[PDB]
């Protein structure tokens, strides 16, 4: 279905009943990425999987891609679904959205699973890489994606890197102007920075990082886990940016651990 | 998006430009299952992925679920999208739908990839099984799905059997009344039989079967391949019912190289 937030349609799917779990997909992808999580958790929970604005089946306006605005889209979805508080599972930019949600709407948070995310991402990337995105968008993005999956994943599951390279090459799913607008926003995916405000996040937080993730380094997740009070970090062996796809069942067990 | 057909809303997703390829998911699942195919093929083709009636995000009436009405839903989607002709990729019941569409609308078919399907399936089921599905629906369905996955896939990718067992256990995705209505239909999943008319299908057709598939045997697919004029049979090692999930990249390579 769709919710409307200030004229922008956000697509979402909702299955099952119980304690709500909200899945927030990584940048340039969509809700489909949660295929192996969505339905097993729909057996025990109220699963809500969202397409961010500018992604997949949601509207893709020319501008308005701050993490705060994304968070407001999420709140719109929760409002239409009459949800008070929810479990938030965020991947990359989804983690950003979840954290921002903890900042602006702590009253709607049960807890967080942050998968492969960080803050002040833009300044942490090599300076040349931005120029690479200005010079050759698709090429630079591909190069970045070769560091998003583990070697073991490249061996046994090449379809992951395939589908992820496909995600940003399909204008129907992820048009170029959304990338440009998000990069241009002073609080977009690259510029969003809450290093000083992390310690205000008090909700139960499980930060999960892949050992071989070069898109989001172990240090980047560590910055998150170390400054959020009572946060736990799990550095996952033989995994890159997409734990939910690289080793789906194990991610499912880890998320199953967040219950009490 | 979605189209109305017989007052029943059929959900579909649409990506890309070019030669139309229509993905039809197996029984009790939904379009999400095509995640690793949908977007790589959206780079080169016009991908159209459909949620069957009684499944996923589409409407789920009490009746009725003959293969013909399913097919008609597909042509409804094609009509709304102004698509004249398309390549059809159907799995299990999706293959049935595709074949029925070949029977009723041959001018709408470029070619077919029929994956793990059959006809007159209900005749091949053990005499006891029928009662088993209403006495113990969950258990019998699960037992059915344990023969739909290869040993290697159950070993290295348990998330597949997990998500498939999840599909029919979540009423929001697949309610039992759809199963029962489909079973009760004289032209439903089990009763649909076109052995007589297989020789009428003239489109380029690739029938693909998993060697360890037990819900549709190698024999089941082989009958189709042997009676459809010019049809190909490809038997895949260490794959059961879900080649597009068990070895997604390999399935991809097979599909890009298929004539259509």
Cα separation of B194 and A200, whole Å? 65
Enumerate the residues of chain A whose CB falls inside 8 A of the CB of residue B14.
Answer: 172
Alpha-carbon separation of residue A17 from A30, A235, B58, B141, B174 (angstroms):
23, 31, 19, 22, 14
Whether A93 contacts A66, CB under 8 Å: no
Q: How far is A30 from chain B (nearest CA, A)?
A: 10
Which residue from A minimizes the CA distance to B246? A157
Question: Distance of alpha carbon B108 from its chain centroid, rounded?
Answer: 18
Q: Determine the straight-line distance between the first and last CA of chain B, rounded to whole angstroms.
A: 26
Residue B155 tokens read as 């070993």
Please name the member of A38, A159, A248 whose beta carbon is closest to the beta carbon of B36.
A159
Determine the residue of chain B that is closest to A249 in CA distance.
B159
Tell me if the bond preceding B167 is cis, omega within 30° of 0. Answer: no
Contacts of A13 in chain B (CB under 8 A): 57
DSSP state of A106: G
User: Is any Cβ of chain B less than 8 angstroms from the Cβ of A237?
Assistant: no
B171 token code pair: 């009423």
- Contact in structure between B231 and B144 (CB atoms under 8 Å): no
| Interchain contact, B159 vs A57, CB within 8 Å | no
In angstroms, the Cα distances linking A79 to A14, A66, A85, A110 are: 13, 20, 10, 16
How were these coordinates obtained?
A: X-ray
Mutate: best of A17, A31, A32, A158, partner B, most B CBs <10 A: A32
**Tokens linked to B244:** 């597009």
Flag whether residue B58 sits within 8 Å of chain A, measured between CB atoms. no
Inter-chain residue contact B166 with A248, CB threshold 8 Å = no
The domain segmentation of chain A, as residue ranges, is 1-260
Task: Give, as one character, the DSSP assignment of residue B26.
Answer: P
Question: DSSP class of residue A119?
Answer: S
**Architecture of domain A1-260 in CATH?**
3-Layer(aba) Sandwich (3.40)
Does A137 lie at the interface with B, CB-CB under 8 angstroms? no
Give the residue from chain B lying closest to A42, CA to CA.
Answer: B170
Name residues whose C-beta falls within 8 Å of residue B108's C-beta, 6 or more positions apart in sequence: B75, B78, B84, B85, B86, B101
Q: Is A169 in the B-facing interface, judged by CB distances under 8 Å?
A: yes
What is the experimental resolution, given in Å to one decimal place? 2.6
State phi, psi for A144 to the nearest 5 degrees.
Answer: -65, -35
**Most A CBs within 10 Å, among B30, B39, B174, to test the A interface:** B39
């Amino acid at each position: 279905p769709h919710v409307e937030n200030d004229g922008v349609k956000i697509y979402y799917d909702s299955y099952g009943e119980g304690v709500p779990i909200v899945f927030l997909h990584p940048f340039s992808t969509n809700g489909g990425i949660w295929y192996f999580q969505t339905f097993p958790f729909a057996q025990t929970n109220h699963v809500i999987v969202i397409d961010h604005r500018g992604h997949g089946r949601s509207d893709k306006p020319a501008t308005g891609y701050s993490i705060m605005e994304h968070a407001d889209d999420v709140v719109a979805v929760l409002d239409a679904l009459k949800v008070d508080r929810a479990v938030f599972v965020g991947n990359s930019i989804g983690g950003m959205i979840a954290m921002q949600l903890n900042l602006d709407h702590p009253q709607r948070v049960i807890g967080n699973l942050i998968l492969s995310s960080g803050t002040g991402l833009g300044e942490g990337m090599p300076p040349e890489a931005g120029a690479a995105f200005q010079n050759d968008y698709i090429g630079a993005f591909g190069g970045l994606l070769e560091g998003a999956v583990s070697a073991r994943s490249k061996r046994e599951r090449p379809e992951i890197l395939a589908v992820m390279k496909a995600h940003f090459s399909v204008p129907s799913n992820f048009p170029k102007h959304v990338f440009d607008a998000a990069t241009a926003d002073p609080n977009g995916v690259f510029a969003w920075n809450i290093k000083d405000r992390l310690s205000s996040i008090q909700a139960p937080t499980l930060v999960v990082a892949g050992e071989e993730d070069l898109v989001t380094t172990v240090a980047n997740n560590q910055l998150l886990a170390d400054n959020i009070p009572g946060a736990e970090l799990r550095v996952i062996n033989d995994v890159g940016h997409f734990y939910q796809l690289e080793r789906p069942s194990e991610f499912n067990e880890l998320l199953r651990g967040f219950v009490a």
